[PDB]
Design a protein around this nucleic acid. Structure first.
Lengths: 244, 244
DNA sequence: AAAGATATCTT
DNA sequence: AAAGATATCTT
C-alpha cells in the first residue's frame, strides 16, 4: 500500500543518511544547532523527497501549502479521487535519555477541526485520512567544533547535535491524547508514552469519531473544563448523561 | 569595535555565500523549502560561525541557551566583566518586492522585560546591550520547490528559495515600534518601514528608557489598552496624567 | 489593527 | 497539568 511503502522508505532513509549541516552553492558547510526548531526543520526537509517519490508510485500528486500557516505539510490525492485526499504532517520531539516517554503537539483544536476551511490547504471534508510522521531524537550538547565552517572534504568530521533518531507513521486520531499539547496556541496533545506505543497505536480514543467529538467540544481553560470535562473518563460520563 | 567588525563580517559573508540545502555526512543534498520557518533557521545557523569568530577576536566568550525557550540566541561576555553582557538575537522577515515596508516581531513584552530572570539565559540586569541581527529575504514567485535530492557536483542546479537577501545589525530599542507584533504570544512590534530606516535607526522612541517603560506597561488587549494607551502619543499623555 | 493562527517547549 | 513562553505570519 501507499502507507506501508511510505513508512518502509522513511525507516530506511533514516537508517542510511545522517544530516550534518547546511551547504552553500559555493561549497561552504555550516554546522547544525541543537534546537528542536532546527531539527524539526531538518527532518521536514529530509522527508520531502521521500514522500514525493512514494506518492508518485501510487499515482498521487503532492501539494505543499500555497499560503503560509496552512495545514497540512503535505496533501496527497489522485485526480480521480478529489474527495479522498490524504494529509501528512511532520512532527518532532526530543528525548534526554534514550527511550524516555515522549509527547507531541498534534495541531490546533480550534482551526480546521471546528471550521471546514480555516487554516487548511483544502476544505477539511475533502480529506479521508490524517497521518503523522513522528521523529524522535536524543539530544547531544553542542561544543566548540560546531561553531566553525567546514569544507566538503570534512563531511564525516562534523559534530551533530543529536543521536538515535527514530521515526513512525500513524493516524493522528490513533495517537491523540486527552490533554492539551499547548495552552495559548490551543493544540491537541498526543498520548504521553514510549515510542513503541506510537508505532502500535495504543491511544486513548475508541474511534476517529470520538477523537473529533472530544476535541471539538474541549474548552480552552481549566476554569471552563471544570464544569464539563478535562479527560477521557469525564468526557465519557458527560456523554453518558446526555452531553451535560 | 566588536559591533563594527560584526556588521562588516555579516555583510561580507552574506554577499559571498548563498545557502542552498541541507547535506548529510554521506554527501546527499536535500533542497530548502520556501517558508520563513525554514529560512529563519538557515539564517541563524549561517550567522553562528561569523559571530563566534568576531567575538573571539575581541576576547568575548559566546554562550547559546542551554534551555530551549530562553532569550537570547547568543550571549557575548568577557570573563573580566560579567555585568557587561551583550545579547544578540537573529530575526527574519520577507518582502514580496524589493522596496516594500517590512516589520519584525522583537521578542516578548511579558517575559524578561517584566521579570529579571524569566525566559533569559542570564539575569536581564547583567546585559548592557541588546542587538538585533535582521535578515530580510525577497520571496520567489514559484510555489513548488524542488522535491528531488542532489549530489555535491550538482550544487549550482539547486533552486534557491529566495530572490535576494539583505542583513542589518541594530539596537532593539531603536527599531521598536508602538504596536504589538503578535497577540496571543505578546510580542513587541518593530516600526513598519523600508529597509533603510532599520539600518539608519529611524525609530519612534526617544530613548531606551522610554522603550522599556512603554512595553513594560502595555496592556495585552484592545479593551484594556483603550483606558490607558494604544500608541506612543497616548503613552506620552498617560505619562502627563500621572501614570493613570 | 487586533486577535489568533502556524510548531513545540518549560516550569 | 495548565498556562504561557520560544519566532513569525495572516486573518
Amino acid at each position: 500500500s501507499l502507507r506501508s511503502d511510505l513508512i518502509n522508505a522513511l525507516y530506511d532513509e533514516n537508517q542510511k543518511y545522517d544530516v550534518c549541516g547546511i551547504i552553500s552553492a559555493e561549497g561552504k558547510i555550516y554546522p547544525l544547532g541543537s534546537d528542536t526548531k532546527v531539527l524539526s526543520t531538518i527532518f521536514e526537509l529530509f522527508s520531502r523527497p521521500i514522500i514525493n517519490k512514494i506518492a508518485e508510485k501510487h499515482g498521487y500528486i503532492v501539494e505543499e501549502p500555497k499560503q503560509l500557516n496552512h495545514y497540512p505539510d503535505f496533501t496527497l490525492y489522485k485526480p480521480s479521487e478529489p474527495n479522498k485526499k490524504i494529509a501528512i504532517d511532520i512532527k518532532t520531539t526530543y528525548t534526554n535519555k534514550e527511550n524516555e516517554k515522549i509527547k507531541f503537539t498534534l495541531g490546533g483544536y480550534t482551526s480546521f477541526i471546528r471550521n471546514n476551511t480555516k487554516n487548511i490547504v483544502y476544505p477539511f471534508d475533502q480529506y479521508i485520512a490524517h497521518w503523522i510522521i513522528g521523529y524522535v531524537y536524543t539530544r547531544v550538547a553542542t561544543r566548540k567544533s560546531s561553531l566553525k565552517t567546514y569544507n566538503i572534504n570534512e563531511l564525516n568530521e562534523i559534530p551533530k547535535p543529536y543521536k538515535g533518531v527514530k521515526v513512525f507513521l500513524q493516524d493522528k486520531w490513533v495517537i491523540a491524547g486527552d490533554l492539551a499539547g499547548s495552552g495559548n496556541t490551543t493544540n491537541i496533545g498526543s498520548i504521553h508514552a514510549h515510542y513503541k506505543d506510537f508505532v502500535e497505536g495504543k491511544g486513548i480514543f475508541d474511534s476517529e469519531d470520538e477523537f473529533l467529538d472530544y476535541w471539538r467540544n474541549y474548552e480552552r481553560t481549566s476554569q471552563l473544563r471544570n464544569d464539563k470535562y478535562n479527560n477521557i473518563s469525564e468526557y465519557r460520563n458527560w456523554i453518558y448523561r446526555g452531553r451535560k
